[PDB]
Amino acid sequence: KPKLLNKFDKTIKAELDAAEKLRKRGKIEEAVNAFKELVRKYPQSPRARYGKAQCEDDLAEKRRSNEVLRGAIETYQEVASLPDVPADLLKLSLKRRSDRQQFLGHMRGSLLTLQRLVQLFPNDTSLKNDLGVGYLLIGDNDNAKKVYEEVLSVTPNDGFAKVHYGFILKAQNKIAESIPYLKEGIESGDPGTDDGRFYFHLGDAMQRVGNKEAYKWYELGHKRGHFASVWQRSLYNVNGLKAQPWWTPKETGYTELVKSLERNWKLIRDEGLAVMDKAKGLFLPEDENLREKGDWSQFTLWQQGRRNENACKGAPKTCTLLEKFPETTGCRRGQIKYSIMHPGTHVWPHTGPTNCRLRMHLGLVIPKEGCKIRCANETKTWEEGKVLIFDDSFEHEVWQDASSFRLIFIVDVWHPELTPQQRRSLPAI
């Protein structure tokens, strides 16, 4: 049902369909040559240059090389400079250009294309919404906000605009205000609203205002295929891995690592405390977004399977000890770090980025009261010299209401059911 032919193109249809059918066939290099060999025959053929662009685009995905895709991007541009272009074609051409620009990471370039599209089609609400995304991708939330306010002023019930507007409000720390927009947008069922990210932000927003209803939406998100479960909501996952919030050492199979940590715990403690005393600067503040209040800092020895040399100079014995255990030092999706938390601290409920790791906590300095950690429905406490093990892809939450500082040692390990080849293959997080 789209009109892709000006007065010109209608005359040469039998040829255009030929070159097109070639592409549909998958015999690409020819459709290219075909399409290439039609502009010289007739330069002012939008449907010809557009065709060429598609081939280049199609070819980009086959060759999987960004240089050819860059070619397509300009060819799409060329379509829009021709004398008489069908509205549908012009729109298709530039929209696709913008999308590919975003794919390459040319965010401001995509934005410029979207700005052009919006002035070319002032009445297309779909394109205004896309422009808003353009602004978001360069971090210009203020202009994005203006865009979605325009849309909503004309189309009060556009779901796409609502979830994005809600997102923007939440990013501006207007948490409570963001929730109705996120809800209504998702409930609209409009194209682009069935996105895990909006379930994430909606749930997060509700939890930060104490609305227990958040779990209803996490459950819905799970049923929509956005989360592994109501509790397990990590983004980068491997299917088939045993999924439970709390693990015993025996269940993990990493009994020797655990034994080594527990048996040498005073040593691990003392080197961490020595850094605190003599080089407190190496303890960096933890994720500000996860901290409601209080004081919370970390000192990393390993990150994504990479040893931090300067840090291991501060805790040489501890690093020497860990070298023996590649299941953690080689875990490219985990870390090894000291974590200190002071009284009056609360960490928002949250989830890790992957189900490919388990997280061990060795207690080093644990006040007799006030410190606890919940993972899923079970809350537990640390013990000095003892290891806790949980799957941090499950929602967990932390409190520190003691009268003195709490120090733990965090050791990530590969999920034990991951194969050697999997461990070798997975990219880092």
Ligand SMILES: O=C(O)CNC(=O)C(=O)O
């Ligand atoms: O240091 C703490 O108490 C908080 N730790 C976590 O949330 C974690 O290990 O994933």
Ligand SMILES: [Mn+2]
């Ligand atoms: Mn955590």
